[PDB]
Write a protein that binds this ligand. Structure first.
Ligand SMILES: [Mg+2]
Ligand SMILES: [Mg+2]
Ligand SMILES: [Mg+2]
Ligand SMILES: [Mg+2]
Ligand SMILES: [Mg+2]
Ligand SMILES: [Mg+2]
Ligand SMILES: [Mg+2]
Ligand SMILES: [Mg+2]
Ligand SMILES: [Mg+2]
Ligand SMILES: [Mg+2]
Ligand SMILES: [Zn+2]
Ligand SMILES: [Zn+2]
Lengths: 157, 43, 174, 55, 80, 177, 82, 37, 37
RNA sequence: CCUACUUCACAAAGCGCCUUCCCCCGUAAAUGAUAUCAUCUCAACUUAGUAUUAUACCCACACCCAAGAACAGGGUU
RNA sequence: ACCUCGAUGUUGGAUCAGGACAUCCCGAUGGUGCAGCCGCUAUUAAAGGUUCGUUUGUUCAACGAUUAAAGUCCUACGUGAU
């Protein structure tokens, strides 16, 4: 990881870049030949939004996701990680990855929030039983996650 | 709000009916029984 | 305590004496009512915590009345307070800055000219009044065939709902 | 086949290890003997019974 | 902007950023935008020194900076 | 056993006080637990005519957590009765107004729709924050486990767990991040 | 060390099978409360109905009287079991 | 802004952005290209 | 209603169950081929 | 509400007089990733952007009454 | 031609109106063949308002004078035990 440092001296500002210490993948992945980190470490369908220890490894210091060309994630797992990161941010599980810079907003505890809180209109007219307007929960991208319960996940409530 | 015109289950505009996993499993079970019946009648 | 922004002081209980004209320097008449403060005293004080409301409360009593026509509990309360029973007691919401010891008298000078005030009172009771007078309904014509319908309400509701909506304007006490 | 510890890496329910059959059969025999000795010594008061009668 | 100077050692590696910066800054569109602005693409770690019309100097050491970052800083200082 | 008739009956049909902590808990699961306890369906001696309900005290109801976007999508509807008196207030607005209405309404809906529901709601006690009255606290008997385990934040994860979790990829050395 | 259920409440369950395996024996002696898990012994109509409802955590409805019809319908000599 | 069930970029400068829960065609050179899903 | 209708005629519940049971099930290739060499 | 005017006259009225106090959202923008540009963001987020309305009101025989169908209510020092 | 013919009184008007928004006016907003004034178009908004007359039974229509506007509808083409 390189960091750009700028110093203003007199009227001659300098700016350079220094390569700090970089993390290294843990030795001996359980499943070598995996084309991406997840499928290589046997995590294809065994992580959720709350697995911050996993998600943060693909996180910019301010909460943004990292590109595929850098992370090495396959497309599907990259989408899954992005959605899990969004859900974790909305649930407040990443308090040290906040946006760079605040009036006090009401504190409502959330989790498994698919949509941005400010982009969903209230369901004033829920439909009849056969056409009910249901509130999405979680993400369909995780529909294939390992299900230890007999009943599958209910992605809509 | 949310009216089904006329009578449910008969008209052109019927109340939608959806098959549950329970019903699917029941039908599959009956199909398995009938397949075994075919086998035992084939001899 | 000295006055501070956001402070609410106590009011009074006056007696509506009447009305009279009053002309301003621009030659404009104004009808002005007379409110006489008759034996207005602070009677009870309850703090924020005691009353559970957002503001403390001061009870103010006015228009001393006969002790022979009051309940025993009220007579005991006024005997403890040291004042004759009052006709009306009203509760004023105040900040703790404006707390006043019970028994203190209040005077019309509590207000001053140029101030703006709110006055609450029981309106003149007109009894069970018809819809026309109570709600200003237009009513029906006096002539042109109208049979026994000149001041009656029209349709009170619609046929579909098969009922009368709560809060419907109907004849009643005004 | 190692999987890093995640919310879904392992089943939610705790892992249970049943006793080995030999030692468990020995314990079964010991418990049966204890209850049999209780019956022999009459260390019981009222007895209730679930009995299938009629239907 | 008054003058722009880019220095680098091509036989030494880690010069792609500065070389691309030179190509982009010397692109005919920029020089036509400011003909008065003078580019001196010397060459001899790699550095870029920009002197503006207000006598203000920006120094970008492109050893570990990508061309996009260098150009963004250059444009930001142009805006001032 | 060996109790007298009246003490035995009292012990059997005694009402217990349970405590639920709603911090970061789904109001629906809280309501399910509370409704079971209030109806007394957790007692083997249960019967709808036995009035075997138990007191449920739910604290921190202000800090309940809704799954999904229910805070903005769930609408609580009511009608004052007067024309134009239809009020539809979102879950977030209702929570901000009354910090107990969400759980109260969830329990009310989950309870059976008969004449005992209001008595069960009387037995129910709800408190927005950690504070509980002293008499209620003394009445409390048992604390029920929270239906939802609260996930740990990164700030809460210990360094040992972070070290145990492996690094899944080698980031390029010359990346600004 | 395996226990099908915790033994900290109620009886201590021990399951067994007779040698023939045709009958299950259960040894469940009751557990006594430890002395350390114990504490030392310490040493108008409207308002009335409201007070009673507050006291017994019920609604006002049950505290109102009933008519002669219901009062005389109530059975004053109900059958008694045990 | 015109409401369209199908969004089309009517020139090079039009761009698609998903905002407040729906897609928008925004354009600065030709504001009349502004479309809302 | 005729056998052929301008709208999608509602199927008898048993026919609906038959169709749902006889829906196409794609072959699941165990390990996803995307992340195999 | 009755000080005037008017109908009128111990009063009721208007044609007379007096008092009447907060929002709502469609979009327009900052910073910024997925996609190191850019991007108003069903990304995290910062403003216009406020509701969770706030405050206000009410809170204890008998005779007469501005209280009233009855009842009830106020006064009787 | 499914309820009602051992009766579900049915045009227009008066009276009182409840509701929808697919908004006529007032509010906010994007576009314009938006210079300004008028406009047109679209998003959001139903809290409030949405005139008086001549002929005609007219609902409507025309016309006269206005208005910020003189909205489209549903309500047994709302409402005749008013
Ligand atoms: Mg029908
Ligand atoms: Mg008249
Ligand atoms: Mg007649
Ligand atoms: Mg007459
Ligand atoms: Mg950027
Ligand atoms: Mg017929
Ligand atoms: Mg026929
Ligand atoms: Mg009949
Ligand atoms: Mg609209
Ligand atoms: Mg019709
Ligand atoms: Zn993969
Ligand atoms: Zn365009």
């Amino acid at each position: 990881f390189r960091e750009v440092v700028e110093t203003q001296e007199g009227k001659t500002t300098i700016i350079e870049g220094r390569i700090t210490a970089t993390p290294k993948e843990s030795p001996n992945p359980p499943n070598p030949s995996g084309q991406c980190p997840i499928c290589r470490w046997n995590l294809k369908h065994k992580y959720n939004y709350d697995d911050v220890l996993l998600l943060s490894q693909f996180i910019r210091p301010h909460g943004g996701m990292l590109p595929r060309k850098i992370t090495g994630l396959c497309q599907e797992e990259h989408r899954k990680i992005e959605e899990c990161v969004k859900m974790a941010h909305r649930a407040g599980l990443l308090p040290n990855h906040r946006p760079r810079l605040p009036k006090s907003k009401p504190q409502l505890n959330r989790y498994l929030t698919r949509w941005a809180p400010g982009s969903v209109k209230p369901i004033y007219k829920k439909g009849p039983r056969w056409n009910r307007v249901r509130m999405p929960v979680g993400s369909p991208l995780l529909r294939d996650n390992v299900c230890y319960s007999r009943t599958p996940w209910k992605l809509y409530h | 709000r949310g009216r089904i015109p006329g009578r449910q289950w008969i008209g052109k505009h019927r109340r939608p009916r959806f098959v549950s996993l329970r019903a699917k499993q029941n039908m599959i079970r009956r199909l398995e029984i009938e397949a075994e019946n075919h086998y035992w009648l084939s001899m | 305590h000295p006055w501070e922004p956001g402070s609410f002081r106590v009011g009074l209980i006056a007696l509506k004496l009447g009305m009279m004209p009053l002309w301003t320097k621009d030659g404009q008449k104004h009808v002005v009512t007379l409110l006489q403060v008759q034996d207005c005293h602070v009677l009870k004080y309850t703090s924020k915590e005691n009353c559970n409301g957002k503001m403390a409360t001061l009870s103010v009593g006015g228009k001393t009345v006969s002790r022979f026509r009051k309940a025993t509990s009220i007579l005991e309360f006024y005997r403890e307070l040291g004042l004759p029973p009052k006709q009306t007691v009203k509760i004023f919401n105040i900040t703790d800055n404006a707390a006043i010891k019970p028994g203190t008298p209040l005077y019309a000078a509590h207000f001053r000219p140029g101030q703006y005030v709110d006055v609450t009172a029981k309106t003149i009771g007109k009894g069970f009044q018809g819809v026309m007078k109570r709600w200003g309904f237009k009513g029906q014509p006096a002539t042109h065939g109208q049979t026994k319908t000149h001041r009656r309400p029209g349709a009170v509701a619609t046929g579909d709902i098969g009922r009368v909506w709560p809060g419907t304007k109907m004849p009643g006490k005004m | 086949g190692y999987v890093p510890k995640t919310s879904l890496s392992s089943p939610p329910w705790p892992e249970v290890v049943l006793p080995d059959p030999v030692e468990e059969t020995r314990h079964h025999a010991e418990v049966v003997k204890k209850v049999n000795e209780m019956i022999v010594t009459g260390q019981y008061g009222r007895l209730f019974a679930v009995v299938h009668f009629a239907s | 902007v008054k003058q722009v100077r880019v220095q680098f050692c091509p036989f030494e590696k880690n010069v792609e950023s500065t070389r691309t910066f030179l190509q982009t800054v010397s692109s005919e569109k920029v020089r036509s935008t400011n003909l008065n602005c003078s580019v001196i693409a010397d060459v001899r770690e790699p550095c870029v020194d920009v002197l503006f019309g207000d006598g203000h100097r920006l120094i970008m050491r492109g050893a570990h900076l990508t061309a996009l970052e260098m150009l963004t800083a250059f444009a930001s200082h142009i805006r001032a | 056993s060996s109790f007298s008739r009246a003490p035995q009956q009292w012990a059997t049909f005694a009402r217990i006080w349970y405590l639920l902590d709603g911090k970061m808990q789904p109001p629906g699961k809280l309501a399910a637990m509370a409704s079971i306890r209030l109806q007394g369906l957790h007692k083997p001696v249960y019967h709808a005519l036995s009035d075997c309900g138990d007191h449920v005290v739910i604290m921190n109801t202000r800090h309940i957590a809704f799954s999904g976007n229910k805070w903005e999508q769930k609408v609580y509807s009511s009608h004052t009765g007067y024309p134009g008196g239809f009020r539809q207030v979102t879950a977030a607005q209702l929570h901000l107004r009354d910090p107990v209405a969400i759980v109260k309404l969830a329990i009310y809906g989950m309870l059976p729709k008969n004449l005992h529901r209001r008595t069960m709601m009387e037995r129910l006690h709800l408190f927005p924050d950690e504070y509980i009255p002293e008499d209620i606290l003394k009445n409390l008997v048992e604390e029920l486990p929270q239906p939802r385990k609260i996930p740990k934040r990164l700030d809460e994860y210990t360094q040992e767990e972070i070290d145990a979790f492996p690094r899944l990829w080698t980031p390029p050395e010359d990346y600004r991040l | 060390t395996y226990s099908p259920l915790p033994d900290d409440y109620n009886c201590n369950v021990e399951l067994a099978l007779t040698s023939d395996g045709r009958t299950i024996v259960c040894y469940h002696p009751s557990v006594d409360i430890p002395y350390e898990h114990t504490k030392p012994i310490p040493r108008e109509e409207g308002p009335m109905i409201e007070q009673l409802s507050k006291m017994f955590f019920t609604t006002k409805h049950r505290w109102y009287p009933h008519g002669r019809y219901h009062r005389c319908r109530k059975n004053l000599n109900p059958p008694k079991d045990r | 802004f015109k409401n369209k069930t199908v969004l089309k970029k009517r020139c090079k400068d039009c761009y698609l952005v998903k905002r407040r829960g729906r897609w928008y065609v925004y354009c600065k050179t030709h504001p009349r290209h502004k479309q809302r899903q | 209603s005729k056998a052929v209708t301008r709208h999608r005629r509602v199927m008898h519940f048993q026919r609906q169950k038959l169709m749902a049971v006889t829906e196409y099930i794609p072959p699941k290739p165990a390990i996803h081929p995307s992340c195999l060499p």
